[PDB]
Every structure is written in C-alpha cells, then in structure tokens.
C-alpha cells in the first residue's frame, strides 16, 4: 500500500518519513471513506463482470475458441475466465490498497515468465483488461469513474 511504499523508501534511505510524505499519507486516508464503497461496488459483481467480459472478448478474438486456439474446450475457457476473475480481484485489492503494490507484487511481476511456458496471448490480455476497465466503470458514477480509471490503466500500461 501507500504506507508500505513510503516506509520502504524511508528505511532504504535510513530516515524518518518526510514533511511532504506525511501530507500524502494523510491524504491517502481521507478519501478512503469514499473509496471503500467504490471498491465495494465492484466486489458484488465479481462473478458477473468477468462473465460478461468473456462475451466481450472471445467474440472479438475468435481464434481463442477455435481449433488452433489456446482456450478450446469448456475447461480451457474456464481457466481464462478464472484468470479474468483473478485479475479483477487483484485490481480491486489494489483499489482498496493505494499504490500498485497488491497487483504488481502478486500477479504482475512475471507475467511474461509465466506465459513463456503457458502459451497465452499477452496482446489478448491487453484487450481483456481493456474490456474489464470498459465494463467495470459504468457501475460507478463519473466521480467514482475518475477514482477508478487510473487503477484500471495500470494493467494495460504495464503489460506492454
């Protein structure tokens, strides 16, 4: 989280938190009251947004469910949908957390090294998270959309 990111820098430089660092640590909490319902709203759709994004993604890329495709079969499709659910859970975790910490530390550092022995399309995950961000914002208002858009941008900005 933000506290972890600040304390890591402080301990790396061997010093207390800074006079501009506490101003950010306090501003990270005052919007937490609003943000709690923002990440909450995506929480009770978690088995629905991914379910719809399957219908947004494997018709866009039909080779994912074609004989030369990686997601042929009901169980193979289930794996891709479970991966989408994992990414949705992680992005919600980071939304509740602050900085990129929850997603980067768990399911972002080593995507290419995983898929290197997995044969799963990174350019397909690009559109997958594009559609996830596309469908997860209309549940929110524009005020919440402004507090949700950058949190969605990091996946398609990192895997690239």
């Amino acid at each position: 989280s933000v506290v972890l990111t600040t304390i890591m820098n402080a301990d790396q430089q061997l010093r207390y938190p800074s006079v501009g660092e506490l101003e950010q640590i306090k501003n990270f909490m005052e919007d937490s009251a609003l943000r709690l319902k923002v990440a909450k709203t995506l929480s009770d759709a978690n088995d629905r947004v991914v379910k719809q994004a399957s219908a947004g993604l494997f018709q866009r890329r039909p080779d994912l469910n074609n004989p030369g495709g990686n997601a042929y079969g009901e169980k193979r499709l289930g794996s891709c949908i479970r991966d989408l659910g994992w990414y949705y859970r992680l992005i919600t975790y980071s939304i509740v957390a602050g900085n990129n910490e929850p997603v980067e530390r768990i399911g972002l550092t080593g995507i290419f090294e995983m898929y290197r022995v997995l044969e799963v399309p990174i350019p397909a995950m690009i559109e997958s998270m594009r559609l996830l961000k596309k469908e997860a914002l209309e549940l929110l208002s524009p005020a919440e959309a402004e507090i949700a858009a950058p949190y969605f941008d990091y996946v398609i900005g990192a895997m690239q």
Binding site: D11, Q12, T109, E113
Partner: protein, 68 residues
C-alpha cells in the same frame, strides 16, 4: 579486529535471476565487525533471514585490540 562467522539465505523476489542463483542465496562467510552491520542489514532489507552469528575472532572484553 574481529570477523563474525555467520550463515544466512537471501531470496530475490523482484527480478527472478536466471543463472546459477544458488551460491548467492545461501552462504557462510567471515564478515568484519566494522562491516557486519551493513552486511546484516542487507539480508533483512532483501527479506532473507540470518541463521546464526558467531564471534570467532575476538574476545568479549573489547577495550584495547578493538581497533584495526
């Protein structure tokens, strides 16, 4: 003048180094007293744990003979 004889393991969890990542992940080595603190802080910063530390070289009294 004295060297601590210690053993420890340090895992790298940000880069996944991909060549002979075994000798640099578990080691025993004599480290000087003046450099022991900076050596041991690195293991804690990276995330590994120190398994044991030993005086080895010097006596507990200190006073004269400490310098080097």
């Amino acid at each position: 003048s004295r060297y601590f004889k210690v053993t420890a393991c340090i895992p790298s969890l940000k880069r996944v180094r991909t060549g002979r990542e075994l000798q640099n992940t578990f080691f025993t080595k004599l480290v000087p007293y003046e450099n022991w603190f900076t050596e041991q802080q690195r293991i804690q910063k990276a995330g590994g744990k120190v398994l044991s530390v030993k005086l080895f070289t010097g006596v507990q009294g200190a006073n004269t003979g400490v310098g080097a």
